[PDB]
């Protein structure tokens, strides 16, 4: 289902969870002609009160989004969240099919380190 590169950071000064969506690679092809039109939907479980979407990157299986989204999350609540990064195939007329997703449970993220990480997308 491809791979996603992202970076997770927390601005303690402003109580901001910072989600960098760098790129995806080796995505499956969902359009005729052997390509896709990927974008990423980004939101937090379990409350789901704010969703972001990257730009749509047309006709590519290796989109470089280079976008960053911020969520106001009080520090004491951050460990109860799960970050969802869901990669969709855009289509002009039909429903947008999900390609894959990667979820990050915050109750294991320490922010003891901030890195750019690759993950295999999952169903």
């Amino acid at each position: 289902l491809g791979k996603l590169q992202y970076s997770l950071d927390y601005d303690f000064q402003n109580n901001q969870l910072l989600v960098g969506i760098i790129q995806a690679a080796e995505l499956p092809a969902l359009d005729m002609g052997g390509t896709s039109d990927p974008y990423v939907k980004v939101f937090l479980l379990p409350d789901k009160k704010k969703k972001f979407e990257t730009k749509v990157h047309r006709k590519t299986l290796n989109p470089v989004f280079n976008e960053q989204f911020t969520f106001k999350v009080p520090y004491s609540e951050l460990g109860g969240k799960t970050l969802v990064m869901a990669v969709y195939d855009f289509d002009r007329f039909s429903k947008h099919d999900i390609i894959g997703e990667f979820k990050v449970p915050m109750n294991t993220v320490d922010f003891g380190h901030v890195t750019e990480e690759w993950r295999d997308l999952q169903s």
Partner: nanobody
Framework: SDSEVQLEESGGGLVRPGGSLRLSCAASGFPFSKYFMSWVRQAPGKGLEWVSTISASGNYETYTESVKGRFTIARDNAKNTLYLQMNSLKPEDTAVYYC??????????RGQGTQVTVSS
């Protein structure tokens, strides 16, 4: 809320077509090294438009189609500074250039701007 953010551009000026210019931007009031940063511009007669974004790490750079290959974005997280090297400048590149906090959003926090005019 970016009430504390301060962004200060410099480096603008008059350029002949084909010439070069380097902008810089001093950033204060927020953990600069954690944020993606962007250059955006507003040309005479057009809306604000995205020019380039650099990741917080400085490792990933993206560029609007009309400046690809000609502009380079860079950052120094130790000195909280953002740079835009502009080579092979075109008259269409005339605009107020702004350094901006985050990846592209029409309402993103921006500096005061620096004027770049490309003229014969």
């Amino acid at each position: 809320s970016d009430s504390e953010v301060q962004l200060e551009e410099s480096g603008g000026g008059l350029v002949r077509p084909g010439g070069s210019l380097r902008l810089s931007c001093a950033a204060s009031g927020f953990p600069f090294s954690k944020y993606f940063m962007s250059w955006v511009r507003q040309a005479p007669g057009k809306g604000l438009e995205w020019v380039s974004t650099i990741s917080a790490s400085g490792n990933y750079e993206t560029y609007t189609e009309s400046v690809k290959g000609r502009f380079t974005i860079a950052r120094d997280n130790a000195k909280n500074t953002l740079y835009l090297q502009m080579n092979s400048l075109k008259p269409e590149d005339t605009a107020v250039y702004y350094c901006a906090k985050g990846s592209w959003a029409r309402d993103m926090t921006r500096g005061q701007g620096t004027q770049v005019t490309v003229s014969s």
